């Protein structure tokens, strides 16, 4: 569970309409801190976490100026892509892209990566060694060669290794308060008899990494335990639960226990 920075971008062409829609956004861990939309009245990079408002105007002018140059490429990228796969100018299409650095034991990065997908399916990814690319098919194979002739994976290693880690830290410190302080869950359990079922709640926690577990009479029983998708609360926190139907008789003999780096607490009805 190391800290991560991710920039996520998507281009969807709206044929018949105007220029393709472009949304870019950044995440430190599970927290969106910045966003772009060509659809917004004034398309321009802008803050989505208090700790980033702190950055100066020239920082914004440059981030915005840069992502604004991203959209142009992806506009051009969409056509290129539609011509590789020999595709009529009539269907809507989506090109998405992501780039990230993951933090090692000390400062320096643990994993860096950049990748692309076209219409849902994978396309072009930067290799672990940050020095090569895996293409999904003949189409992406063309991009690989372009990248290769353009010596480009250095420029990309550069960022991932330097800039990325660097700013990851800057934002981490400037947001120690929220990025580095874990919210522990306010857990409990609830009843609800059908026959009877037993639900184990975990609310208001950060980050969204949590495991949930119910114990029968001894250890792990996970054959009918309900596995609800971990959801945003709406404030910076998250929410989840696991639940079981038990024969209405031995109820406090079941214990749901949960770990979260914010020791592994254990709880019951």
């Amino acid at each position: 569970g190391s800290h991560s920075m991710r920039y996520f971008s998507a281009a969807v062409s709206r044929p018949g309409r105007g220029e393709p829609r472009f949304i870019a956004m950044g995440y430190v861990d599970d927290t969106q801190f910045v966003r772009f939309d060509s659809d917004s009245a004034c398309p321009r990079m802008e803050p989505r976490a208090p700790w980033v408002e702190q950055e100066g105007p020239e920082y914004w002018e440059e981030e915005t100026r840069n992502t604004k140059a991203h959209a142009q490429t992806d506009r051009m990228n969409l056509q290129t892509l539609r011509g590789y796969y020999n595709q009529s100018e009539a269907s809507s299409h989506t090109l998405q892209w992501m780039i990230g650095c993951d933090l090692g034991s000390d400062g320096r990065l643990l994993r860096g990566y950049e990748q692309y997908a076209y219409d849902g399916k994978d396309y072009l990814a930067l290799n672990e060694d940050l020095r090569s690319w895996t293409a999904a098919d003949t189409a992406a194979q063309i991009s690989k060669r372009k990248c290769e002739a353009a010596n480009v994976a250095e420029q990309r290693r550069a960022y991932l290794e330097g800039t990325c880690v660097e700013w990851l830290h800057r934002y981490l410190e400037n947001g120690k308060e929220m990025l580095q302080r874990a919210d522990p869950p306010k857990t409990h359990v609830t009843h609800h008899p059908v026959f009877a079922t037993l639900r184990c709640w975990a609310l208001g926690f950060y980050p969204a990494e949590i495991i949930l577990t119910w114990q029968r009479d001894g250890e792990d029983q996970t054959q009918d335990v309900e596995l609800v998708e971990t959801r945003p609360a709406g404030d910076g926190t998250f929410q989840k639960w696991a639940a079981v139907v038990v024969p209405s008789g031995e109820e406090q003999r079941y214990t749901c226990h949960v770990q979260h780096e914010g020791e592994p607490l254990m709880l019951r009805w």
Binding site: T73, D74, S143, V152, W167
Partner: peptide
């Protein structure tokens, strides 16, 4: 901070 250039497929 976002990466300046974007690459052309």
């Amino acid at each position: 901070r976002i990466i300046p250039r974007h690459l052309q497929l």
